[PDB]
Amino acid sequence: MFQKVEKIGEGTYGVVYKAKNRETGQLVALKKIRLDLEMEGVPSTAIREISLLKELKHPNIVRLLDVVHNERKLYLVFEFLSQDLKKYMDSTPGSELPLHLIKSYLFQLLQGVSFCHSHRVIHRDLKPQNLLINELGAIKLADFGLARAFGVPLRTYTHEVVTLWYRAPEILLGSKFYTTAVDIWSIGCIFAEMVTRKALFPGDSEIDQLFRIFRMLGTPSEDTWPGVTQLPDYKGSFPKWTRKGLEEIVPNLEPEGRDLLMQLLQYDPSQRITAKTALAHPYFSS
């Protein structure tokens, strides 16, 4: 059926494997769902990932090759890419990312995200582990299990979304609505992590996460973020930290890169740059 050459981790649903198609010899990555163990049948995350990737096709988005239902297992067949950005940065070649590669990876990331948003899809789990790199320099968004096709206009969705370290402050403060802006926040965090080699905001809790952000960017006010005091999990009792200069955090980053990072990490989702606008930024100009 599929020659399961190797296992390569666990996932949102079931377990993940490298493999080969026998009638082609082509490499694929396999997500296995054990339908026997699923009281609710095909999990919502898998129905969402499959349906979204059936139509969301772009050079900077992972391809879903097939869906195979055999016995009481459902297999999602994705294109095989060599590794994710996290495994790359954790390995010797990748310990020190060249400035040109940080830029070409970020550009691609923004292209993929811009295509999602223009297609009314919000990823809601952008982090290095979910960005797959090939041997030629391409980077692609993966794991659309946490994504949602949004309405125009949208409504209230799952309250607690995005891996904690990549989670935008409008989510941490319990805003009723969040937008495509939550993806841009995650990209800001990923950009800083490529430059510094470590997570920008490695919180151990929602409040710790919120405090690490305020320490770096300063405590938001009605002046810098209108409506923030009205947000459900906002408290007057927050310390009033003051905005650190960004040159101190990412000194090896060129000034136009630091400008872009600062626009990506605007705490007011209303003022946060879009992926489309980020792609027009001078950082990317020749």
Partner: protein, 276 residues
Amino acid sequence: RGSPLPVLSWANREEVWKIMLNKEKTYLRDQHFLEQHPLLQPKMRAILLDWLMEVCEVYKLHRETFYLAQDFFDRYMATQENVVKTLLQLIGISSLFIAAKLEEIYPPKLHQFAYVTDGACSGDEILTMELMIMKALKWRLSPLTIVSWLNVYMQVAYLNDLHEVLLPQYPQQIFIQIAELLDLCVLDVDCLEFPYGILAASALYHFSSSELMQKVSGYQWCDIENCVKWMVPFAMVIRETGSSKLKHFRGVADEDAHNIQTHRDSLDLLDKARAK
């Protein structure tokens, strides 16, 4: 048709629209699909969809969830032949199970989808059917629904000075009044002759004007004329019976209540409307 959307910060408004219009080309409907099931009667589809709307109101499911289920049911039946009438309930409740897992935060459990069938459909029968449906549809489970088009038209109608498109800002009463006409129309399989965006534009026209229909939809009269004329008796029966008030739902913010699927005796209304 040109884009009724304002300039967007997050995309090219003309691309966003082109992508939405391409959906109506990718997701096909066939007003004659019951010719492939020659001993089924259109009234059987009406009864099944009316019943799904009732289940939706009981469990406070979104209108989006109901219209996903309706689309899944209609597209799935168009892929099959000779389905016996005793399986329509299983196909409908399995379509709604898929829609609910897609669209709701905390969908009802499988046991509630079985429960509401009063013994006709087991959990295991629903898990078998959901895979049959999703494979027959090739996992194309992202249509732009009838109600998604009403949502976008209402947002364009009421657009604020900031041209905000993603944060909802239309009134609730106009929304549910138009949705109620759409819920009646969708019970008639002839509705599937019209693109979903045209069905929505047409029900909006019946509650407003040519000027508003054109502004929010970008359609010209010639595009919607046949749909508008087909919808006349449905609009009349709704105007004569009177429009329903906004409901309160347990645990739903009263400002989000307009998004919850409702149910009234629409089979009565449907008879009157098709009579003319």
